[PDB]
Write a protein that binds this ligand. Structure first.
Ligand SMILES: CO[C@H]1/C=C/O[C@@]2(C)Oc3c(C)c(O)c4c(O)c(c(/C=N/N5CCN(C)CC5)c(O)c4c3C2=O)NC(=O)/C(C)=C\C=C\[C@H](C)[C@H](O)[C@@H](C)[C@@H](O)[C@@H](C)[C@H](OC(C)=O)[C@@H]1C
Lengths: 98, 1113, 224, 230
C-alpha cells in the first residue's frame, strides 16, 4: 500500500519533516558507516527475496523506518556533542573501504 | 471492386494543386517568352521598375544606361548533382544594358554577366545549398486605403497602404485631440495642412470647400501659418525630416511619396484605382499625388480621403471598414511576388553602385559590365531564398505533406506589420474568416489561425489577387468567384433535380447569414451564381481525406486533418478502406510517383528503372530508390507491369512512398474492436496484437545521415584516415575500408562510423616518458582518435556514404574545411510500445501493449482482432464519426470491398446497413456452410443484448445475430478467458496511420557521462550520452514539497559543483556512503564574482559577528 | 456417458474440425480454449531464418534485372512453408538460381532432401531481361515468434537475417454447440477445428497441444 | 539458477480452507492457460454433500412462520444451506436427517438425529431459535452432488411438504486468481499464476485443486482415438 506503516511514523514525530529528517540521518549513520546499530536483528530484521532466497536490502532508510517504529532511538537536543556523537562510534568498530 | 457514394461534381479540384507555386514562378519568371512580350511583375518589372540609372546633375552630360532584355539560361550543374555537392540549384541570369552619352556614343555590353537565380523544380519548390525548401506564401492587407476605427478612444483614422511592404510608404491620417490631423509617413508626425498646402489645398480653398459638415477644422487651420505659402512649405516639411539637411527648396524626395511610379505605384491600374475609386469619391491615377507636371504638384488621393474621413466621422458614408480581414483586403504574395521584390531589392543596390561609378570614372572609360558589378542581385537574392523565415525546409515525411506545404498560406512572415508571433492584434484575427476560400480546420497549436492551409478547388484565373473559390450559375461553367462577390447569393450544394433542382427551399448562402432559401429558383442562370461545385471547396486538401468528416466534430477533425501529415511511409501502405475520392490525386500531383507520357508500351527489365514506354522515342525511367527524407522518412518507388500499354483506370507506372497504386496510402487499415481492455487502453493508449508485427505491418524504414568535417586548425591538418591511433582494436578495418565505413556495414551504437585524426598538442612529454616510450617501444604519437562513431542511436545497416572535398568541382566548402564525409544509415523500425497510432478522425493515442495472438478478442470463426481502440471518452468526449467506417468496416471485410464515401456526400447509415445486410449472409452464411451455428455462448449474449433492448425479442437467435450485426458485432469472445463478452462489442476495419514519433527517437537516460567545459553542467560529449533539464517549474515543485536536500542536489552534486559532483560518482562507486556536500560550488563563486566588481561580501554567522570563514579553503 | 465420442473430420494437411461429443455442461471450454490457446502459441514449426542473395550487400537493396525489391523478396520468403520429412535436422538451406524472363515462384527452389515446399506458387521474384538471382536461404526449426534476435549469420557476410514465424498453426476457433441427447439438454458439444497449418497436421497440432497442457498441468505436483 | 523447465508450486494451507497456491515461472500465456480451467472446474465438477429438500412438521410451503420459534422458514431454510455434512462409507446416496426441539434453547445443527456414518462437520450453525413452544420438527434430506442447483431438482422424499432448498454441493465456494509477471529468469515478462481456493463445503482446498486437476486431466485424454473423414 505504502511503506512499513507511514501513518504510524507520522504519529510519533510532530513536524512531518521531523520523521523525514530523523529517518534520514538515522539510515545516515546506520548502514551508512557501520551496520551494527540494528534493533531488528533478533528475528524482526528486513530481508528481501531473490533466486537463492532472502538477503537484507541495502536500502538504509528501510531499516530506519522499521527500526524507528520500534522502541530505541531518540531525538531533540539530546546527546549534545555531535563530536562525541560519532567519537563514541570509534569505541565500536566503524569505517569502510577504499 | 470500388463502391462510390455521391452526387454531381461539375468540374475538377483544379490541377495541379501545386499551382499556387509552379505556375506562379514561371509567370513571374516570364523568362520563357521571346523578349518581345511580357511586360510587368517580377523579373522584368523590377528591371523596368528600377529606373534607368540617372547620374550627376539631372541630364547635364553623358551616361544614361538603359535596360533591354534579360537572360536566364544555361543552368550550372543539375538537380541531385546539387543536393549532393551542396549546390543551390540556380541558373545564370545576365541582362543587356547600354549607357548613353552627350558626346556621340551608345555602348551595349551584351548580356552583361550577372547574378544567379534559384530555379523551381517541377515539384514546385527549390533546392538551396543542397537541401529542399519551399517558399510559403504570406498574406497582408491588399494595397489601398480603408480607414478603420481609432483603437484608442472612438475616432477613426485613415491608413494608406502601399503596393507591397518593401515598397512605398504606409501613411496614416489621424484626427486627434491635441494637434488635429496628423500625416504620419514612415517615422514622422507633421500637421496635415502642411503637405496639403504644398499640394495646393489651403485655407478656404481647402476648408469651407472640403470640411464643413463636420467641423474638426479650426485645428486644421491653427498652423495656417504653414498654409500661407507653398514651396517654403515643402522646405518646412523637408526641414521636418531628420537630419538637419539643407532647408534649400527641393521638390525632390517629395519627388517620390507620390511623384514617379518609382517608390509608390500599384502600377498597371488594378488593385489601386478600383479600390479607392470604389471607396473614396471616385477617379484617380496610378499613384497618390502627381508632380513633375509643371512645377507644382497635382495631388489625387489625400484630401478626398480626409474628406471621406469626416464623412465617416458624423456623416453617412461611414463604413468603419478596417483591416476587415475580408479576403477582399487580404493579399497573397505568391512566391514569384516574394522572389520578385527581392529582385527589386537587389537593384535597389545595383544602381547605388552604378550611380557611384557613373561619376568617379570617365565618360569613355565607362561602359556596361564595368559600372555593373553583379554582386547585389546575389546575396540580396541568395540571402532571401535560403535565410528567410518564409523560405522553409521541405516537410516530406509523407508525400501529402510536402504537397500541403505549398498549399500553405503563412502570416508570421516578414511582410510589413506582418503579425509577429504576437503582433498587435494576434487573437481575434485567427478567427474563421466568413470568406471561406481557405481551410476552416487546419491551424495547429499556440500558432492558431496565422498558419492556414487552402481550399481544395480554391483560386485560378487572371490573378490580380485573393483565393476566389468556384461557383456554379446554372450548369454554365463555374465563374471563378471573387471574394467580394455579391452575385445575388449562392445556394449550397444539393437539391439536385437533373438540371433544375426542384427545391422550393434552396438552402443558400448570401453575404453572411445562412439565409433560409432566397429561392430565386431562376433555374437557368442559377439564382445569380448560387451553388458550389462540390462541398470539398469549403475545405483543405488533407481534411478532405476524411471519409466521414460530416460527423467528426470540427475541432477533433483538425487533429486528424493535421496529424495525418505526420504519417510516415510503411512497407505495405494500402489505401484506406473507406476513402473519399481525392486520394486518387493528392499522390499524383505530388509527383512522388512516376507518370507515363504518351500512349503505352514498355520494355523495362524491372528493378531500378521502368525502362521506357516504347511508344515513339524511348525513355528509361530511374526510380528514386530508398532515398532519404528531410524528416528521415525514406520515400521510395515500387514499379508495375511487365508488358503493357498506357493505362487501366490509371497510367500509374510505378508507385511511390505511400501510394497503394496511385492511391495515397499513409497508413495501413486493420481490424479493431472497440472496448476497454483490462486497462491497457486508458485515456487514449491503444493495444496491439502481436500479429501486426509478425506480418511486418506498421514497420517503417528510416535512413539517417551523419557528418564529420576535416578541418585544418593550426596544430596539424584534421584528416579522415583509417589509421586511428590505438583504436587498433579489430574495428578500424574490421569495417571502415580506406577510411570510411563500408556499405551494408551493419552498425551498432559505438562503432567507428568514420574516423579521422587531429594533431592537437596538449603537452610536450619531458623525457622519462619518451625514454620509457623509446625503451618499452612506446612509439610516440601526434594524433587524437577523433573519429565519428555512431551515437546512442541503435545504429543499423549502412545504406550508403558520400565524400566531398575542396578542389572538387562545384563544391563550395567552409573556409579551411577540407573534405566533408557523409554516411547514411538505415533502420527498419517495426512497431514498439510507445508510438502514436492516431487515425484520420483524430483518434491520436500512443501504443501501450502488444498482446500475443493467444489472448486478444477472438472473433467467432477464430480470426483475431488487431487493435483494441478504447471507447471511453474518446468518441463521446470528442464526438466524431470514427465509427461509420468501423461499421462500414466488416461491411467491406467479408464483402471484400474498398469504399468511396466523400466529404458530406454519401455513405449513409442505412446504405451501410444494407452493405451490412450483405456480408453475413456469407459471414454467417459460412457457419451454415462449414457446418455450424450459434453456440451456447451467443445464446447467453443475445438473451442479454435483447434484454439491453438491443435486439428484437421474439426473433430467433440466428435472427438476433443479423440484427446485432448491422451495427455492433457478433458476441466476440475473449481468447484470454475462453468465455464471452456479455453484450455485443462493435468490430471493424478502422485504419490507423503511424506518426513520425515512434519512441526510439525519444528516451535517453543519463547517470554520468559527458561534462561540458564551457558551461559545466551535464551535456555535450562523445562516449555515452544524456543530460536532462530542471527548468524552474520543477524547482517550485520541490520547494512546494520540502525535498530541500533533494533540491540542493540538483544544483550541486549533479552539475556544476565539481567537488560535490565527484563526491557523487565516488561516494557510490565506493560503497556504504552517500554524497556529502557542505560548501555549495555556487555560493563559493558568488562572492568571488562580486569581489571582481570591488564589492566586499562579508559573510556572517548566527551572531552577525562570527564573520564566516568561507573560501578559507 | 462417462465416455465421449471423439469424432474427427480430418482433412489433407489443414482444416480438421475435431468433435468430442457429450461434454458435461461446461467443459466445452475448460478444454475448448486452453487447446486453441496452446495451438496458436507453443508448438514446433519451420521458418525461414536467414537468406543470402548473389550480388547483394545487405537488406535495402535492388537486384538489377528483377522486378521486386530485396525487402519485398524477404517479405515474401517470410511466408514460405517448408516440411521436413525427418527429425534430426536443426535446419537445412534451400538454394535457387533463376534465368532471364519468368517468375521465381516458390517451386523453383532446389529440389532436395526431406524438404517439401509445401507452398509452391508463392510468388518469390518476378525477375526478367536479366536472369540473376542465386539465393541460399536457411530454414531452421523453431518455436513461436523470434525476430531479429536469432542472428542470420550462416553465410557470415550478407545473410540479411529474416524474421521467423515458426508456429505451423495458422488459425483456430471452436464451436460449443448444444445438440446432444446424453442426459437433459445441457451438455456442451466441443469441436475445435485447428484450421490451416504450416507443414504439420491439425491432428498433430491438436495432439502436441494436449501434450503441453498435460505436461504443464503436472507442475502442480510437489508444493513447499 | 532456479525456475527453468520446472516451476515451484507454493501452497498456503490455511487449514480447512483458503488454499492459496503459487506455481511460478511459466512462459507468458499459461498463468491463464491453467489458472482458469482449474478455477473454472474448481467452482463446479467436484463431489459434494448438500442439504437439498426440507420438511418441518406443520406448515406446508416455505412462506411461513412456525410459532414458538424466533426464526421463519427462510432463515432456517438458509441456515440449513450453510450446513456441512460428510458421508462415511461409499454406499450412502443420502441419509435423511430429522430433529428434536425443546424449550427456549437453541437448535444447533447438532441436535440433528445423531445418525452415524453422517456427522455434521459443523456443530453450531444457528438453524433457528424456539422458546415456550418447543415444537419444530424436521426430517431434512441431504445429497451427493456436482456443483450448484436451484429449485429444479424437486425435493421428492416426503412426497408432499418439502420446500426443497437449493443444491449447493461443491466443497469449494469461491475461486479467484491473478497472474502477475515476475522475472526470475532474466526476461521480465514471465507469468506467475497464484490461485486461492476458498472451500469448506466439506473437502479441503489443495484437495479440491488436485482433484479438479485430475478432472481436467482425464477429459483431455478423450482426444486420443479418433474417427475422421477424408
Ligand atoms: C525558415 O522557416 C522557419 C521560420 C521560422 O520563423 C517563424 C517565425 O516564421 C514561421 C513561418 C513563416 C511559418 O510558416 C511557420 C510554420 O508554417 C510552422 C511553424 C511550426 N510548426 N510546428 C511546430 C512543431 N510541431 C511539431 C509541428 C508544427 C512555424 O514555427 C513557422 C514560423 C516561425 O517560427 N508550421 C506549420 O504551420 C505546420 C502546421 C507544419 C509545418 C511543417 C514542418 C514542421 C516544417 O516544414 C519544419 C520542418 C520547418 O519548415 C520549420 C522549422 C522552419 O524552419 C526551417 C529551418 O525550415 C520555419 C518555418
Amino acid at each position: 500500500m505504502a511503506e512499513p506503516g507511514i501513518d504510524k511514523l507520522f504519529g510519533m514525530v510532530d513536524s512531518k519533516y521531523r520523521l523525514t529528517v530523523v529517518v534520514a540521518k538515522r539510515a545516515q549513520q546506520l548502514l551508512r558507516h557501520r551496520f551494527k546499530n540494528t534493533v531488528l536483528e533478533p528475528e524482526e530484521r528486513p530481508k528481501m527475496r531473490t533466486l537463492e532466497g532472502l538477503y537484507d536490502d541495502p536500502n538504509a532508510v528501510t531499516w530506519a523506518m522499521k527500526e524507528l517504529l520500534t522502541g530505541r532511538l531518540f531525538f531533540g537536543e539530546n546527546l549534545v556533542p555531535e563530536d562525541r556523537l560519532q567519537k563514541e562510534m570509534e569505541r565500536l568498530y566503524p569505517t569502510e573501504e577504499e | 471492386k470500388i463502391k462510390r457514394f455521391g452526387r454531381i461534381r461539375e468540374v475538377i479540384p483544379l490541377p495541379p494543386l501545386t499551382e499556387i507555386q509552379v505556375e506562379s514562378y514561371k509567370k513571374a519568371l516570364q523568362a520563357d517568352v521571346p523578349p518581345e512580350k511580357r511586360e510587368n511583375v517580377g523579373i522584368q518589372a523590377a528591371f523596368k521598375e528600377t529606373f534607368p540609372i540617372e547620374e550627376g546633375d539631372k541630364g547635364k552630360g553623358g551616361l544614361v544606361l538603359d535596360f533591354l532584355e534579360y537572360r536566364i539560361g544555361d543552368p550550372p550543374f543539375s538537380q541531385d548533382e546539387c543536393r549532393e555537392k551542396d549546390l543551390t540549384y540556380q541558373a545564370p541570369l545576365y541582362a543587356r544594358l547600354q549607357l548613353i552619352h552627350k558626346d556621340t556614343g551608345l555602348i551595349k555590353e551584351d548580356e552583361v554577366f550577372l547574378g544567379h537565380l534559384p530555379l523551381m523544380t517541377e515539384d514546385g519548390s527549390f533546392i538551396i545549398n543542397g537541401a529542399d525548401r519551399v517558399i510559403v506564401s504570406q498574406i497582408h492587407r491588399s494595397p489601398g486605403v480603408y480607414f478603420t476605427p481609432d483603437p484608442a478612444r472612438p475616432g477613426r483614422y485613415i491608413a494608406s497602404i502601399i503596393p507591397l511592404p518593401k515598397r512605398g510608404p504606409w501613411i496614416d491620417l489621424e484626427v486627434e485631440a491635441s494637434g488635429v490631423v496628423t500625416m504620419k509617413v514612415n517615422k514622422r508626425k507633421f500637421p496635415l495642412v502642411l503637405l496639403l498646402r504644398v499640394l495646393g489645398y489651403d485655407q478656404e480653398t481647402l476648408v469651407r470647400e472640403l470640411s464643413a459638415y463636420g467641423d474638426l477644422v479650426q485645428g486644421l487651420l491653427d498652423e495656417a501659418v504653414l498654409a500661407m505659402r507653398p514651396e517654403e512649405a515643402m522646405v518646412r516639411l523637408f526641414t521636418l525630416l531628420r537630419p538637419g539637411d539643407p532647408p534649400k527648396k527641393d521638390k525632390a524626395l517629395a519627388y517620390l511619396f507620390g511623384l514617379l511610379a518609382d517608390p509608390k505605384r500599384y502600377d498597371l491600374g488594378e488593385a489601386g484605382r478600383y479600390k479607392a475609386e470604389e471607396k473614396l469619391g471616385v477617379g484617380l491615377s496610378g499613384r497618390t499625388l502627381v508632380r513633375f507636371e509643371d512645377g507644382e504638384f497635382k495631388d489625387e488621393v489625400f484630401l478626398p480621403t480626409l474628406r471621406y474621413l469626416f464623412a465617416l466621422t458624423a456623416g453617412v458614408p461611414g463604413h468603419e471598414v478596417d483591416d476587415i480581414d475580408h479576403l477582399g483586403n487580404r493579399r497573397i504574395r505568391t512566391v514569384g511576388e516574394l522572389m520578385a521584390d527581392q529582385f527589386r531589392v537587389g537593384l535597389a543596390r545595383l544602381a547605388r553602385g552604378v550611380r557611384e561609378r557613373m561619376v568617379m570614372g570617365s565618360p569613355d572609360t565607362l561602359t556596361p559590365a564595368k559600372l555593373v558589378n553583379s554582386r547585389p542581385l546575389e546575396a540580396a537574392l541568395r540571402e532571401f531564398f535560403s535565410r528567410s523565415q518564409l523560405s522553409q525546409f521541405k516537410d516530406e515525411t509523407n508525400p501529402l505533406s510536402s504537397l500541403r506545404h505549398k498549399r500553405r498560406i503563412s502570416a508570421l512572415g516578414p511582410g510589413g506589420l506582418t503579425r509577429e508571433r504576437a503582433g498587435f492584434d494576434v487573437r481575434d484575427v485567427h478567427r474563421t474568416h466568413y470568406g471561406r476560400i481557405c481551410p476552416v480546420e487546419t491551424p495547429e497549436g499556440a500558432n492558431i489561425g496565422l498558419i492556414t492551409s487552402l481550399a481544395a478547388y480554391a483560386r485560378v484565373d487572371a490573378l490580380g489577387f485573393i483565393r476566389t473559390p468556384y461557383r456554379r450559375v446554372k450548369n454554365g461553367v463555374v465563374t471563378e468567384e471573387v471574394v467580394y462577390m455579391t452575385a445575388s447569393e449562392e445556394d449550397r450544394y444539393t437539391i439536385a433535380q437533373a438540371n433544375t433542382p426542384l427545391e422550393g427551399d434552396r438552402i443558400a448562402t448570401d453575404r453572411v447569414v445562412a439565409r433560409r432559401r432566397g429561392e430565386p429558383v431562376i433555374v437557368a442562370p442559377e439564382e445569380v451564381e448560387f451553388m458550389d461545385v462540390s462541398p470539398k471547396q469549403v475545405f483543405s486538401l488533407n481534411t478532405n481525406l476524411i471519409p466521414f468528416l460530416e460527423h467528426d466534430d470540427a475541432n477533433r477533425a483538425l487533429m486528424g486533418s493535421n496529424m495525418q501529415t505526420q504519417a510516415v511511409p510503411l512497407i505495405r501502405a494500402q489505401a484506406p478502406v473507406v476513402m473519399t475520392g481525392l486520394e486518387e490525386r493528392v499522390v499524383r500531383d505530388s509527383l512522388a510517383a512516376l507518370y507515363a507520357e504518351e500512349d503505352g508500351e514498355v520494355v523495362k527489365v524491372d528493378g531500378t528503372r521502368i525502362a521506357v514506354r516504347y511508344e515513339d522515342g524511348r525513355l528509361v525511367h530511374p526510380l528514386r530508390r530508398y532515398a532519404r527524407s528531410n524528416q528521415g522518412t525514406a520515400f521510395d518507388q515500387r514499379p508495375r507491369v511487365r508488358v503493357g500499354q498506357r493505362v487501366k483506370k490509371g497510367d500509374l507506372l510505378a508507385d511511390g512512398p505511400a501510394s497503394e497504386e496511385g492511391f495515397l496510402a499513409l497508413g495501413q487499415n486493420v481490424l479493431v474492436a472497440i472496448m476497454p481492455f483490462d486497462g491497457y487502453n486508458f485515456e487514449d493508449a491503444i493495444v496491439i496484437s502481436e500479429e501486426l508485427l509478425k506480418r511486418d505491418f506498421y514497420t517503417s524504414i528510416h535512413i539517417e545521415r551523419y557528418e564529420i568535417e576535416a578541418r585544418d586548425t593550426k596544430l596539424g591538418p584534421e584528416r579522415i584516415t583509417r589509421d586511428i591511433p590505438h583504436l587498433s582494436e579489430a574495428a578500424l578495418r574490421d569495417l571502415d575500408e580506406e577510411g570510411i565505413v563500408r556499405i551494408g556495414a551493419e552498425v551498432k551504437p559505438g562503432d567507428i562510423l568514420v574516423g579521422r585524426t587531429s594533431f592537437k598538442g596538449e603537452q610536450e612529454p619531458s623525457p622519462e616518458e619518451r625514454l620509457l616510450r623509446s625503451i618499452f617501444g612506446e612509439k610516440a604519437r601526434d594524433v587524437k582518435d577523433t573519429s565519428l562513431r555512431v551515437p546512442p542511436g541503435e545504429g543499423g545497416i549502412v545504406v550508403g556514404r558520400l565524400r566531398l572535398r575542396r578542389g572538387d568541382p562545384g563544391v563550395e566548402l567552409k573556409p579551411g574545411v577540407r573534405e566533408v564525409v557523409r554516411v547514411f544509415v538505415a533502420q527498419k523500425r517495426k512497431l514498439q510500445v510507445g508510438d502514436k497510432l492516431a487515425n484520420r478522425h483524430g483518434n491520436k493515442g500512443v501504443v501501450a501493449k502488444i498482446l500475443p495472438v493467444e489472448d486478444m478478442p477472438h472473433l467467432p470463426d477464430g480470426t483475431p482482432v488487431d487493435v483494441i481502440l478504447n471507447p471511453l471518452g474518446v468518441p463521446s468526449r470528442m464526438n466524431l464519426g470514427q465509427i461509420l467506417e468501423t461499421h462500414l468496416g466488416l461491411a467491406g471485410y467479408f464483402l471484400g470491398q474498398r469504399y468511396i464515401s466523400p466529404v458530406f456526400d454519401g455513405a449513409t447509415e442505412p446504405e451501410i446497413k444494407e452493405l451490412l445486410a450483405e456480408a453475413f449472409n456469407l459471414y454467417f452464411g459460412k457457419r451454415q456452410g462449414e457446418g455450424f451455428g450459434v453456440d451456447k455462448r451467443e445464446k447467453e449474449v443475445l438473451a442479454r443484448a435483447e434484454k439491453l433492448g438491443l435486439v428484437s425479442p421474439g426473433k430467433s437467435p440466428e435472427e438476433q445475430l443479423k440484427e446485432l450485426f448491422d451495427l455492433g458485432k457478433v458476441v466476440l469472445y475473449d481468447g484470454r478467458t475462453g468465455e464471452p463478452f456479455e453484450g455485443p462489442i462493435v468490430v471493424g476495419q478502422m485504419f490507423i496511420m503511424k506518426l513520425y514519433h515512434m519512441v526510439e527517437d525519444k528516451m535517453h537516460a543519463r547517470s554520468t557521462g559527458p561534462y561540458s567545459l564551457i558551461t559545466q553542467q551535464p551535456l555535450g560529449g562523445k562516449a555515452q550520452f544524456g543530460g536532462q533539464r530542471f527548468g524552474e517549474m520543477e524547482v517550485w515543485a520541490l520547494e512546494a514539497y520540502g525535498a530541500a536536500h533533494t533540491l540542493q542536489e540538483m544544483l550541486t552534486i549533479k552539475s556544476d559543483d565539481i567537488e560535490g559532483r565527484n563526491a557523487a560518482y565516488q561516494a557510490i562507486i565506493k560503497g556504504e556512503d552517500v554524497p556529502e556536500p557542505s560548501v555549495p560550488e555556487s555560493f563559493r563563486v558568488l562572492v568571488k564574482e562580486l569581489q571582481a566588481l570591488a564589492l566586499d561580501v562579508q559573510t556572517l554567522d548566527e551572531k552577525d559577528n562570527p564573520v564566516d570563514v568561507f573560501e578559507g579553503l | 456417458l462417462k465416455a465421449p465420442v471423439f469424432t474427427a473430420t480430418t482433412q489433407g494437411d489443414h482444416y480438421g474440425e475435431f468433435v468430442l461429443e457429450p461434454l458435461e455442461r461446461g467443459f466445452g471450454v475448460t478444454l475448448g480454449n486452453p487447446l486453441r490457446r496452446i495451438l496458436l502459441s507453443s508448438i514446433p514449426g519451420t521458418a525461414v531464418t536467414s537468406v543470402y542473395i548473389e550480388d547483394v550487400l545487405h537488406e535495402f537493396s535492388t537486384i538489377p534485372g528483377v522486378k521486386e525489391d530485396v525487402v519485398e523478396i524477404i517479405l515474401n520468403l517470410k511466408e514460405l512453408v517448408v516440411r521436413f520429412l525427418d527429425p534430426k535436422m536443426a535446419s537445412t538451406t534451400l538454394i535457387l538460381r533463376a534465368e532471364g524472363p519468368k517468375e521465381v515462384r516458390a517451386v523453383d527452389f532446389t529440389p532436395s532432401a526431406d524438404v517439401e515446399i509445401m507452398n509452391p506458387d508463392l510468388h518469390i521474384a518476378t525477375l526478367e531481361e536479366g536472369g540473376k538471382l542465386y539465393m541460399e536461404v536457411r530454414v531452421d526449426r523453431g518455436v513461436g515468434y523470434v525476430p531479429a534476435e536469432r542472428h542470420g549469420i550462416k553465410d557470415r557476410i550478407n545473410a540479411i537475417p529474416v524474421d521467423a514465424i515458426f508456429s505451423p498453426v495458422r488459425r483456430v476457433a471452436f464451436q460449443v454447440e448444444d445438440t446432444r441427447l446424453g442426459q437433459r439438454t445441457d451438455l456442451d458439444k466441443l469441436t475445435l477445428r485447428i484450421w490451416t497449418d504450416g507443414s504439420v497436421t491439425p491432428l498433430e497440432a491438436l495432439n502436441q497441444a494436449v501434450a503441453i497442457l498435460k505436461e504443464h498441468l503436472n507442475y502442480f505436483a510437489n508444493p513447499e
